[PDB]
Subunit: 141 residues, 3 copies
Amino acid sequence: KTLPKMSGGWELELNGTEAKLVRKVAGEKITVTFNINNSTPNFVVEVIKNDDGKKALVLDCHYPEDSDIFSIREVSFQSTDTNYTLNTDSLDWALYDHLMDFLADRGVDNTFADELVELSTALEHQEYITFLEDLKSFVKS
Amino acid sequence: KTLPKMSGGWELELNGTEAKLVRKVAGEKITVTFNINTSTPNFVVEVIKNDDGKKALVLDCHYPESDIFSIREVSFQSTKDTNYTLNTDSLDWALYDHLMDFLADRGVDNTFADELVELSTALEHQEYITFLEDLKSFVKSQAHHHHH
Amino acid sequence: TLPKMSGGWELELNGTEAKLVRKVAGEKITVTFNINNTPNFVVEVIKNDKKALVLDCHYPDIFSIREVSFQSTTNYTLNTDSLDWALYDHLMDFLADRGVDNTFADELVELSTALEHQEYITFLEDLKSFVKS
């Protein structure tokens, strides 16, 4: 019934299968976006600093397969469309550590990544149950 | 020359490589959309009921490699990745079969699928011939000989 | 300083997408390619007279036309393997008359490589600047 809460102070906004998590009290604009169709989802962290509202750092994260719960797959900047995107395999361990720490300082850590799996699983199930109902309502004569 | 006919009173319209077949089945509007580019295309069935024109059931179909076609996935769309899409592998056989029957009652059956292969192949050949003409017309400056 | 393209080509970069434009004798020729992972380039030819011939080129002659189509200024796209050698050669010549020849192809490799290392270096700087505290 009631969806699981995310620790660290986050506001959830739903728009169909697309969920946005916005850090409630922050010095910056931290948004985590994921989609129930696209349950370990793929999530995108968007960071907009106070200093310049023009550009945002976009970190495409995912859950690996067989210690950190998630990984940054690629990084890029986006204006608030095509932009330079760096894959993190081309980064040295020291810069990957800085990126992962940068996320942790903004509350995107292991607890958040574990909690996101629980929230995503719940949203998926909720949408799935509703879809079957709507489908029955439409197709059943 | 003349494109092959689809049984059931379907009305065809082509916009570039995208063909739409439309037919009314008891106030419900059924649209089958496919693209051009031996031609077994992937088609999308959109069902809009008279009762509510707000949403449509969208059934993504294809020809596998016995039913001639298969439903790959299903969703609702307003008449936009925000819509829940169910893959049919997660459906029980009876609901999948029910969906197949729902399509046949609206004329999207095996005969329709077989006829769509024939129409698709024809539209492909027609667009191909037209494209070569337009291409040759565009580079006509490259001719060595001139018929005078 | 980025390497120059022979023929008087105006370069513009929008993110990872570079466009080279040359105004011929009453025809506009645009070559588009991407600076982010020998690139694959797209030639767009618009005559003075509404539509444009789009030629998708790649490096296997230094380059090859992989496929052709028309676009207005969901379109039918023909692969060049289905074309006879004579018409394919007419298309190659048509490109060469508009400045898209072997020299252009070789020069585009050099420009592409330069744009890549430039964008890469700038990105790392911006990244480290953003993430540094």
